[model samples]
Target chain A: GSVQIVYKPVDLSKVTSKCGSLGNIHHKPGGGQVEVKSEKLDFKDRVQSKIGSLDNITHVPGGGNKKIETHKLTFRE
Target chain B: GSVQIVYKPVDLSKVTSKCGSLGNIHHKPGGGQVEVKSEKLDFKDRVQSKIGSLDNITHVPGGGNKKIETHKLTFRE
Candidate 1:
């Protein structure tokens, strides 16, 4: 996939199960967020294999009393 | 190039063929879900090269299941 999933609280149990124990998951105390650092994946080749076509995009913004939807997703440490 | 894709269903044959054999793909059984983690790219540069213009956003939350459109996207991965 082109996007990686990252969350504020590093769910280790979840992370380990999916990525194995090879990756790193740390909480930035000062930043008040958990960071999971992983690797890269090619997109074009994968699309050809699995993805049929580009689908619609959904953007949930982070404001106005709703959950602050995050945007900055980091995978490559 | 600005966004990388992640999925609850990690298709190995599909992922590897695009990202390469060394990449990882698995599910988080504990969380009753699956996750894919990947990388980042220079969004500004990519947009300049590919996107034609910033299209108009029509907000339809006037009271309905109107989709929250996006500001980030990626290629086939």
Candidate 2:
């Protein structure tokens, strides 16, 4: 099984007010993409938690039963 | 910031008797190597845990301050 995790750091000052699943509104760190293949899902979660703040994370299952998750953190005014 | 995670599924039957750190004794799955860059280490641990049984995992800091660890599950015969 393989899991793909993508993370990007966002600047709060430039965030839009919509505030729910800010798709494509962040700065992706260098080599921000990772692919993990293992027999367990626990490993996936651990890698996700260690990244930026888990304020708004989204999981989308694309083709091939492969899962994709977006990671980013948001703040309130 | 990037973290690299490498994992390979091992066949336990062919394992050697001396089992402290089986540096190279496993079958690496397709794209078994992963590089993750982030400001945290939690993600690294998560990726490692999912690969195999945590019976023999070793961490070594290689060049560029980058850390390398060996993963494999061992059992007593």
lDDT of 2 by residue, A4-73 (tens): 3333332221111111221222222222224433332233354532322212222221111112223333
Q: What TM-score results for chain B when candidate 1 is compared with the true chain B?
A: 0.15
lDDT of 1 by residue, A1-77 (tens): 24355333321111111121222222212112223344643333213222111122222211112112223433442
Clashing pairs in 2: A47-B43, B1-B37, B2-B36, B2-B37, B3-B36, B3-B37
True lDDT of residue A77, candidate 1: 24
Alpha carbon lDDT of residue B36, candidate 2? 35
Instruction: Compose the digit string of candidate 1's lDDT tens values, residues B1-77.
Output: 35534533222111111111122222211111223343642332223222112222322121122222223423343
How much DockQ does model 2 earn? 0.03
The ten-residue window of minimal lDDT in model 1 chain A covers A11-20
Please list the C-alpha lDDT of all candidates, in the order they appear.
0.25, 0.26
Candidate no. 1 TM-score: 0.14
Model 1 segments more than 4 A misplaced: A1-64, A68-77, B1-50, B63-77
* TM value for model 2: 0.12
